[PDB]
């Protein structure tokens, strides 16, 4: 049995993307310090421990699953789209996610807020005419107070509906105070929607929408994600494990149940 | 960096239509609103109206019937359009950026433009009539006699008063123009020693570029 | 919508601690009003100073502070410096409508008081021939830059035909100004004595003729 690793993860021959201090999801949403991972691509994406977010406090229900769907796709290719928001202020941002001289937010998300006196009943629609699936990511904002809810969205309680021809997610914000994070007691909740060809993404809301800026091109799940603090070395090796590289010469390995590439069977 | 510039007419006749442009740079119009503030000569500031980032606008109740703000998000231009102009409208026109803080929730006018002056006059370019000013009442108080020169009714600004073609410089005091009737009157006074006037000639020179006229007028006792 | 009111002018000296104030006809100035304090410097080049009542804008020196003091909003320069001389405008938000104040002129006494040199000029024969008479009173070299000009005819007080230029800084930084009294030759003949009364720092210095 193969029962030992070099200790490092060899840079060759699989395109191994080290996230350094960004996890996938942070690099996905576009946390200011993962701006480097934009449009990046990989066979295997290793998430380190250092990893810390540092933008608007958010939570992703169905995290481990949205994470895996992206990880497999292996590309982070984002495609901007001409969304037309008429009636609200776009490009909103915050001090808990500074960028440049001040207030910032996730590069791949667009915070809409009221335009002066009002927040209209948004209802955009965006058809997928292409020959590939589209992975739209959006979110809902949950202010912690009826004051915040109304300063930003006017309406006393908002609602977000993101429908396609076969689905229908209607999440309604939930005002209340969550624990302080980077000075905030507020939160945003990340949702997703895959749109099949000849389908139409439809966003209708009248509050709290944290709109999509476009879509992520999705290829076929040949790639994979892995958490490991293993050093990366310049070397050729086929079987990668959280513990490092192990040779695929023996038929059974007992090093780890998680591996990448032509690997010995786990025992 | 943020930056706002106003480009407008400069001079428009009463009953015509005023159209100023505020060309913003370094921020998007869909991210911020732009405000219009005017400052008539020797008055306070007046808020004209505002165009929000959503396109909707909010105008000053009073002037609302005549104002009209718009904008071309793609060109980065905010447009202030005024109709049925009347003289009162002469004032400096300013566009300033509307700011909102998302964490403390307050409005504010952070970036002010440079401004652009707009005079609403129905006057044709007319040269200034220049009358010389001498003391008249010789009290013989002290060695400093003071002469003056009235530059009545010209248009538009500016005029260039000079005494003795520049020879006299010491205390030439040339005050700002005013708006009597519909033209600009102004004056300038040079002070000299009694042992200089009427002894020597002190001449007043008034060049008014706009109407290529240049009158000199010797000030007699 | 309402009427924001504030001090016409305030005169401090370096070091002193001045406090401009901003009142509301409609009532007390709350946080709801987002009191904005714009600073107008020479030749109308405005600059934001404080937003939302007390949020100090970046460039603004530590010495400027926004606050509510009772039912009115206020700005406090702590240790005013000559470079603080400016017109300080107050703006108050009232439901998607801004309302500015009259502005306060802040003088920061940086030099010795200087008394104006008044000069009344009688109408020129020339100007009279065309049947019009314009009295020119030139007030100059005064400091600080604030005078009040009043006209008098035969001892009685004038209330028409007078126009006074706002004061203008000089090169020596003192001030100059001017006032005109315009009457028709006929009306000019109708009286005997004419006077220009310049009031600066309590005293009044007048010049007159006949
Ligand atoms: C990502 O891809 C799009 C593809 O059309 C391009 O517009 C954008 O600049 C790309 N960004 C980077 C950092 O490669
Ligand atoms: Zn392989
Ligand atoms: Zn002088
Ligand atoms: Zn009389």
Short mmCIF file of N, CA and C in Angstrom, two decimals, chain B residues 91-205:
data_model
loop_
_atom_site.label_atom_id
_atom_site.label_comp_id
_atom_site.label_asym_id
_atom_site.label_seq_id
_atom_site.Cartn_x
_atom_site.Cartn_y
_atom_site.Cartn_z
N UNK B 91 -26.58 84.84 -12.43
CA UNK B 91 -26.01 84.20 -11.24
C UNK B 91 -24.95 83.17 -11.66
N UNK B 92 -24.15 82.71 -10.70
CA UNK B 92 -23.13 81.71 -11.00
C UNK B 92 -23.90 80.39 -10.94
N UNK B 93 -23.68 79.51 -11.91
CA UNK B 93 -24.36 78.23 -11.89
C UNK B 93 -23.38 77.13 -11.55
N UNK B 94 -23.76 76.32 -10.55
CA UNK B 94 -22.95 75.21 -10.04
C UNK B 94 -23.63 73.84 -10.01
N UNK B 95 -22.84 72.80 -10.27
CA UNK B 95 -23.37 71.46 -10.17
C UNK B 95 -22.46 70.81 -9.15
N UNK B 96 -23.07 70.10 -8.23
CA UNK B 96 -22.34 69.48 -7.16
C UNK B 96 -22.82 68.04 -6.99
N UNK B 97 -21.89 67.15 -6.66
CA UNK B 97 -22.22 65.73 -6.52
C UNK B 97 -22.94 65.32 -5.27
N UNK B 98 -24.00 64.55 -5.45
CA UNK B 98 -24.82 64.05 -4.36
C UNK B 98 -24.19 62.80 -3.80
N UNK B 99 -23.91 62.82 -2.51
CA UNK B 99 -23.32 61.69 -1.84
C UNK B 99 -24.25 61.17 -0.76
N UNK B 100 -24.20 59.86 -0.57
CA UNK B 100 -25.01 59.17 0.44
C UNK B 100 -24.10 58.14 1.05
N UNK B 101 -24.09 58.08 2.36
CA UNK B 101 -23.30 57.10 3.07
C UNK B 101 -24.20 55.94 3.45
N UNK B 102 -23.81 54.74 3.05
CA UNK B 102 -24.62 53.55 3.30
C UNK B 102 -24.56 52.98 4.71
N UNK B 103 -23.53 53.37 5.46
CA UNK B 103 -23.32 52.87 6.82
C UNK B 103 -23.88 53.76 7.94
N UNK B 104 -24.02 55.05 7.65
CA UNK B 104 -24.52 56.01 8.65
C UNK B 104 -25.81 56.64 8.13
N UNK B 105 -26.07 56.45 6.85
CA UNK B 105 -27.29 56.93 6.21
C UNK B 105 -27.56 58.44 6.23
N UNK B 106 -26.72 59.23 5.56
CA UNK B 106 -26.91 60.67 5.50
C UNK B 106 -26.57 61.19 4.10
N UNK B 107 -27.23 62.28 3.69
CA UNK B 107 -27.00 62.87 2.37
C UNK B 107 -25.93 63.94 2.50
N UNK B 108 -25.29 64.29 1.39
CA UNK B 108 -24.28 65.33 1.44
C UNK B 108 -23.85 65.74 0.06
N UNK B 109 -23.47 67.00 -0.08
CA UNK B 109 -23.02 67.53 -1.36
C UNK B 109 -21.52 67.62 -1.28
N UNK B 110 -20.85 66.56 -1.71
CA UNK B 110 -19.40 66.57 -1.64
C UNK B 110 -18.60 67.29 -2.72
N UNK B 111 -18.80 66.94 -3.99
CA UNK B 111 -18.00 67.58 -5.02
C UNK B 111 -18.65 68.66 -5.77
N UNK B 112 -18.19 69.86 -5.49
CA UNK B 112 -18.73 71.04 -6.13
C UNK B 112 -17.99 71.35 -7.44
N UNK B 113 -18.73 71.75 -8.47
CA UNK B 113 -18.09 72.08 -9.73
C UNK B 113 -17.32 73.39 -9.61
N UNK B 114 -16.87 73.94 -10.73
CA UNK B 114 -16.14 75.21 -10.71
C UNK B 114 -17.13 76.35 -10.87
N UNK B 115 -18.21 76.06 -11.56
CA UNK B 115 -19.22 77.07 -11.78
C UNK B 115 -19.06 77.68 -13.15
N UNK B 116 -20.11 78.35 -13.60
CA UNK B 116 -20.13 79.03 -14.88
C UNK B 116 -21.16 80.17 -14.77
N UNK B 117 -20.67 81.39 -15.00
CA UNK B 117 -21.42 82.63 -14.91
C UNK B 117 -22.40 82.83 -16.04
N UNK B 118 -23.63 83.20 -15.73
CA UNK B 118 -24.61 83.42 -16.77
C UNK B 118 -25.32 84.76 -16.60
N UNK B 119 -25.13 85.66 -17.56
CA UNK B 119 -25.80 86.94 -17.46
C UNK B 119 -27.01 86.95 -18.41
N UNK B 120 -28.16 87.39 -17.91
CA UNK B 120 -29.37 87.47 -18.72
C UNK B 120 -29.65 88.95 -19.00
N UNK B 121 -29.19 89.41 -20.16
CA UNK B 121 -29.31 90.80 -20.55
C UNK B 121 -29.73 90.96 -21.98
N UNK B 122 -30.51 92.00 -22.23
CA UNK B 122 -30.97 92.28 -23.58
C UNK B 122 -30.15 93.44 -24.17
N UNK B 123 -28.95 93.66 -23.63
CA UNK B 123 -28.12 94.75 -24.11
C UNK B 123 -27.10 94.46 -25.21
N UNK B 124 -27.01 95.37 -26.16
CA UNK B 124 -26.04 95.26 -27.24
C UNK B 124 -24.73 95.82 -26.69
N UNK B 125 -23.63 95.35 -27.24
CA UNK B 125 -22.31 95.80 -26.86
C UNK B 125 -22.26 97.31 -26.99
N UNK B 126 -22.20 98.06 -25.89
CA UNK B 126 -22.11 99.51 -26.04
C UNK B 126 -20.95 100.08 -25.24
N UNK B 127 -20.14 100.93 -25.88
CA UNK B 127 -18.97 101.56 -25.25
C UNK B 127 -19.40 102.45 -24.10
N UNK B 128 -18.51 102.67 -23.13
CA UNK B 128 -18.75 103.50 -21.95
C UNK B 128 -18.56 105.00 -22.21
N UNK B 129 -19.45 105.83 -21.68
CA UNK B 129 -19.31 107.27 -21.80
C UNK B 129 -18.48 107.59 -20.56
N UNK B 130 -17.40 108.34 -20.72
CA UNK B 130 -16.50 108.64 -19.60
C UNK B 130 -16.46 110.10 -19.16
N UNK B 131 -16.97 110.40 -17.95
CA UNK B 131 -16.97 111.76 -17.38
C UNK B 131 -15.88 111.92 -16.31
N UNK B 132 -15.05 112.97 -16.42
CA UNK B 132 -13.98 113.20 -15.45
C UNK B 132 -14.49 113.77 -14.12
N UNK B 133 -13.84 113.35 -13.03
CA UNK B 133 -14.20 113.78 -11.68
C UNK B 133 -13.11 114.59 -10.97
N UNK B 134 -13.39 115.87 -10.73
CA UNK B 134 -12.46 116.76 -10.04
C UNK B 134 -13.15 117.16 -8.72
N UNK B 135 -12.36 117.52 -7.72
CA UNK B 135 -12.77 117.93 -6.37
C UNK B 135 -13.89 118.95 -6.26
N UNK B 136 -13.74 120.09 -6.92
CA UNK B 136 -14.78 121.11 -6.87
C UNK B 136 -14.76 122.00 -5.63
N UNK B 137 -14.82 121.37 -4.47
CA UNK B 137 -14.80 122.08 -3.19
C UNK B 137 -13.40 122.04 -2.57
N UNK B 138 -12.55 122.99 -2.97
CA UNK B 138 -11.16 123.08 -2.49
C UNK B 138 -11.01 123.49 -1.03
N UNK B 139 -11.15 122.52 -0.13
CA UNK B 139 -11.03 122.76 1.30
C UNK B 139 -9.58 123.02 1.69
N UNK B 140 -8.66 122.65 0.79
CA UNK B 140 -7.21 122.81 0.98
C UNK B 140 -6.68 122.04 2.19
N UNK B 141 -7.41 121.00 2.59
CA UNK B 141 -7.06 120.18 3.76
C UNK B 141 -5.61 119.70 3.84
N UNK B 142 -5.22 118.84 2.90
CA UNK B 142 -3.87 118.31 2.93
C UNK B 142 -3.27 118.17 1.53
N UNK B 143 -1.99 117.83 1.48
CA UNK B 143 -1.25 117.67 0.24
C UNK B 143 -1.74 116.63 -0.77
N UNK B 144 -2.72 115.81 -0.40
CA UNK B 144 -3.19 114.76 -1.32
C UNK B 144 -4.51 115.02 -2.03
N UNK B 145 -4.48 115.62 -3.21
CA UNK B 145 -5.72 115.87 -3.94
C UNK B 145 -6.10 114.57 -4.60
N UNK B 146 -7.40 114.26 -4.64
CA UNK B 146 -7.85 113.01 -5.26
C UNK B 146 -8.77 113.24 -6.44
N UNK B 147 -8.39 112.71 -7.60
CA UNK B 147 -9.18 112.83 -8.81
C UNK B 147 -9.89 111.53 -9.08
N UNK B 148 -10.93 111.59 -9.90
CA UNK B 148 -11.70 110.41 -10.23
C UNK B 148 -12.12 110.43 -11.68
N UNK B 149 -12.76 109.35 -12.12
CA UNK B 149 -13.18 109.20 -13.50
C UNK B 149 -14.35 108.24 -13.56
N UNK B 150 -15.51 108.73 -13.98
CA UNK B 150 -16.69 107.87 -14.07
C UNK B 150 -16.75 107.18 -15.43
N UNK B 151 -16.99 105.88 -15.41
CA UNK B 151 -17.12 105.13 -16.65
C UNK B 151 -18.56 104.65 -16.67
N UNK B 152 -19.42 105.48 -17.26
CA UNK B 152 -20.83 105.19 -17.31
C UNK B 152 -21.24 104.31 -18.45
N UNK B 153 -22.38 103.69 -18.23
CA UNK B 153 -23.02 102.79 -19.17
C UNK B 153 -22.41 102.07 -20.36
N UNK B 154 -21.55 101.10 -20.10
CA UNK B 154 -20.99 100.29 -21.17
C UNK B 154 -21.57 98.90 -20.98
N UNK B 155 -21.19 98.02 -21.90
CA UNK B 155 -21.61 96.63 -21.88
C UNK B 155 -20.92 95.95 -23.05
N UNK B 156 -20.37 94.76 -22.82
CA UNK B 156 -20.33 93.99 -21.57
C UNK B 156 -19.06 94.30 -20.81
N UNK B 157 -18.73 93.52 -19.78
CA UNK B 157 -17.48 93.79 -19.05
C UNK B 157 -16.33 93.17 -19.85
N UNK B 158 -15.10 93.56 -19.57
CA UNK B 158 -14.63 94.52 -18.59
C UNK B 158 -14.06 95.74 -19.29
N UNK B 159 -13.84 96.81 -18.52
CA UNK B 159 -13.25 98.02 -19.07
C UNK B 159 -11.86 98.05 -18.44
N UNK B 160 -10.98 98.93 -18.91
CA UNK B 160 -9.61 99.04 -18.38
C UNK B 160 -9.23 100.49 -18.12
N UNK B 161 -9.44 100.93 -16.88
CA UNK B 161 -9.11 102.29 -16.49
C UNK B 161 -7.62 102.32 -16.20
N UNK B 162 -7.01 103.44 -16.54
CA UNK B 162 -5.59 103.64 -16.37
C UNK B 162 -5.50 105.15 -16.25
N UNK B 163 -4.48 105.63 -15.55
CA UNK B 163 -4.29 107.05 -15.41
C UNK B 163 -2.96 107.30 -16.03
N UNK B 164 -2.88 108.39 -16.78
CA UNK B 164 -1.66 108.76 -17.45
C UNK B 164 -0.95 107.62 -18.14
N UNK B 165 -1.77 106.76 -18.72
CA UNK B 165 -1.28 105.63 -19.48
C UNK B 165 -0.41 104.67 -18.66
N UNK B 166 -0.47 104.79 -17.34
CA UNK B 166 0.34 103.94 -16.48
C UNK B 166 1.34 104.73 -15.65
N UNK B 167 1.62 105.97 -16.03
CA UNK B 167 2.55 106.78 -15.26
C UNK B 167 2.10 106.80 -13.79
N UNK B 168 0.83 107.12 -13.55
CA UNK B 168 0.34 107.12 -12.18
C UNK B 168 -0.08 105.71 -11.84
N UNK B 169 0.43 105.23 -10.71
CA UNK B 169 0.15 103.89 -10.23
C UNK B 169 -0.16 103.95 -8.74
N UNK B 170 0.54 104.84 -8.05
CA UNK B 170 0.35 105.02 -6.63
C UNK B 170 -1.10 105.37 -6.28
N UNK B 171 -1.80 104.41 -5.70
CA UNK B 171 -3.18 104.65 -5.31
C UNK B 171 -4.11 104.98 -6.46
N UNK B 172 -4.29 104.02 -7.36
CA UNK B 172 -5.15 104.19 -8.50
C UNK B 172 -6.58 103.68 -8.30
N UNK B 173 -6.83 103.06 -7.15
CA UNK B 173 -8.16 102.54 -6.77
C UNK B 173 -9.24 102.52 -7.87
N UNK B 174 -9.51 101.35 -8.44
CA UNK B 174 -10.52 101.22 -9.47
C UNK B 174 -11.53 100.22 -8.98
N UNK B 175 -12.66 100.73 -8.53
CA UNK B 175 -13.75 99.94 -7.96
C UNK B 175 -14.44 99.01 -8.93
N UNK B 176 -15.24 98.07 -8.41
CA UNK B 176 -15.98 97.12 -9.24
C UNK B 176 -17.20 97.75 -9.90
N UNK B 177 -17.57 97.22 -11.05
CA UNK B 177 -18.71 97.75 -11.76
C UNK B 177 -20.00 97.44 -11.04
N UNK B 178 -21.03 98.24 -11.31
CA UNK B 178 -22.37 98.03 -10.77
C UNK B 178 -23.30 97.95 -11.99
N UNK B 179 -24.58 97.70 -11.72
CA UNK B 179 -25.56 97.54 -12.77
C UNK B 179 -26.75 98.51 -12.73
N UNK B 180 -26.47 99.79 -12.97
CA UNK B 180 -27.51 100.81 -13.02
C UNK B 180 -28.17 100.59 -14.38
N UNK B 181 -29.49 100.69 -14.41
CA UNK B 181 -30.25 100.47 -15.63
C UNK B 181 -29.94 99.06 -16.11
N UNK B 182 -29.20 98.98 -17.20
CA UNK B 182 -28.86 97.71 -17.77
C UNK B 182 -27.45 97.67 -18.29
N UNK B 183 -26.66 98.65 -17.89
CA UNK B 183 -25.30 98.68 -18.34
C UNK B 183 -24.42 98.81 -17.13
N UNK B 184 -23.13 98.53 -17.28
CA UNK B 184 -22.20 98.58 -16.16
C UNK B 184 -21.53 99.90 -15.92
N UNK B 185 -21.78 100.56 -14.79
CA UNK B 185 -21.05 101.82 -14.55
C UNK B 185 -19.98 101.49 -13.54
N UNK B 186 -18.87 102.21 -13.59
CA UNK B 186 -17.74 101.95 -12.73
C UNK B 186 -16.95 103.24 -12.57
N UNK B 187 -16.00 103.28 -11.64
CA UNK B 187 -15.21 104.49 -11.43
C UNK B 187 -13.86 104.10 -10.92
N UNK B 188 -12.93 105.05 -10.96
CA UNK B 188 -11.53 104.85 -10.55
C UNK B 188 -10.98 106.18 -10.10
N UNK B 189 -10.17 106.20 -9.05
CA UNK B 189 -9.61 107.45 -8.55
C UNK B 189 -8.16 107.32 -8.22
N UNK B 190 -7.38 108.30 -8.64
CA UNK B 190 -5.95 108.33 -8.37
C UNK B 190 -5.78 109.53 -7.45
N UNK B 191 -4.87 109.42 -6.49
CA UNK B 191 -4.59 110.51 -5.56
C UNK B 191 -3.22 111.04 -5.86
N UNK B 192 -3.10 112.36 -5.87
CA UNK B 192 -1.84 112.98 -6.17
C UNK B 192 -1.62 114.14 -5.19
N UNK B 193 -0.42 114.75 -5.22
CA UNK B 193 -0.05 115.88 -4.36
C UNK B 193 -0.54 117.19 -4.98
N UNK B 194 -0.94 118.15 -4.14
CA UNK B 194 -1.45 119.43 -4.62
C UNK B 194 -0.42 120.15 -5.48
N UNK B 195 0.83 119.71 -5.34
CA UNK B 195 1.94 120.24 -6.10
C UNK B 195 2.17 119.29 -7.27
N UNK B 196 1.07 118.99 -7.97
CA UNK B 196 1.06 118.09 -9.13
C UNK B 196 -0.18 118.42 -9.96
N UNK B 197 -1.22 118.91 -9.29
CA UNK B 197 -2.47 119.23 -9.95
C UNK B 197 -3.00 120.55 -9.38
N UNK B 198 -3.45 121.48 -10.25
CA UNK B 198 -3.51 121.38 -11.72
C UNK B 198 -2.17 121.51 -12.47
N UNK B 199 -1.09 121.72 -11.71
CA UNK B 199 0.25 121.90 -12.28
C UNK B 199 0.52 121.01 -13.50
N UNK B 200 0.40 119.71 -13.29
CA UNK B 200 0.62 118.73 -14.35
C UNK B 200 -0.73 118.14 -14.71
N UNK B 201 -0.79 117.51 -15.88
CA UNK B 201 -2.03 116.91 -16.33
C UNK B 201 -2.11 115.47 -15.88
N UNK B 202 -3.27 115.12 -15.33
CA UNK B 202 -3.54 113.77 -14.87
C UNK B 202 -4.66 113.36 -15.78
N UNK B 203 -4.39 112.39 -16.64
CA UNK B 203 -5.38 111.91 -17.61
C UNK B 203 -5.93 110.54 -17.29
N UNK B 204 -7.20 110.38 -17.63
CA UNK B 204 -7.93 109.16 -17.39
C UNK B 204 -8.08 108.41 -18.70
N UNK B 205 -7.70 107.14 -18.77
CA UNK B 205 -7.78 106.37 -20.00
C UNK B 205 -8.67 105.15 -19.83
#
